[PDB]
Amino acid sequence: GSHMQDPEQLKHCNGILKELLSKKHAAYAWPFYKPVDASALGLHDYHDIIKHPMDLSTVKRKMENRDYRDAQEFAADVRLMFSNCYKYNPPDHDVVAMARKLQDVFEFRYAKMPA
Ligand SMILES: O=C(O)c1ccccc1-c1ccccc1C(=O)Nc1ccc2c(c1)[nH]c(=O)c1ccccc12
Ligand SMILES: [Cl-]
Ligand SMILES: [Cl-]
């Protein structure tokens, strides 16, 4: 059920999203900007391993379209995106290092959400 704080909290989420997409973080955020194009990358097993792809452009579309009803729903998608990276890639891959850095940005600011 919607709470009177959900709009406020979703603004905090949108602020985080905007930060994740900003130039500040581009050196490590860029792999997460758009859906993984598995064929283009030669990742022909990606969609056998990753059942629920997620990326920041999809999170942005969902936010713009008011698809997210609360902050928890938003956070679950951002975390899904990172988990897909941790699932698919060896843990020493540079994309995993990038994901961990971007997730640290996310988690520290998400934990400042007004309530
Ligand atoms: O070549 C390597 O990079 C390599 C290095 C170490 C071990 C294996 C390989 C490899 C070997 C053969 C073919 C391809 C790869 C490879 O892993 N590529 C690749 C490229 C882009 C992304 C990705 C994986 N995985 C993501 O999760 C992802 C998420 C967002 C955007 C892009 C990517
Ligand atoms: Cl994905
Ligand atoms: Cl979660």
Residue numbers in the entry: 341 to 455
Would you copy out the relevant sentences from the publication that reported this structure?
The BET family proteins generally recognize acetylated histones H3 and H4 (and references therein); however, BRD2 preferentially recognize mono/di-acetylated histone tail of H4. The tertiary structure of all bromodomains contains a left-handed α-helical bundle formed by four α-helices (αZ, αA, αB, and αC).
Here, we discuss a newly identified small molecule inhibitor (NSC127133; hereafter, L10), a phenanthridinone derivative, of the second bromodomain (BD2) of BRD2. The L10 compound, which binds in the deep hydrophobic cleft, is surrounded by the amino acids P371, V376, L381, L383, Y386, N429, H433 and V435. The phenanthridinone moiety, which sits in the deep cleft, is stabilized by both hydrophobic as well as by several direct and water mediated hydrogen bond interactions. One important feature of L10 binding to BD2 is the direct double hydrogen bonds of phenanthridinone O9 and N9 atoms to the carboxamide side chain of N429. Moreover, the O9 atom of L10 is also hydrogen bonded to a conserved water molecule W3 (2.92 Å), which forms a three-way hydrogen bond to the backbone amino and carbonyl group of C425 and N424, respectively, and to the sidechain hydroxyl group of Y386. The carbamoyl moiety, which links the phenanthridinone and phenyl-benzoic acid group, makes direct electrostatic interactions with NE2 of H433. The phenyl-benzoic acid moiety protrudes away from the binding site and does not have any interactions with the BD2 protein.
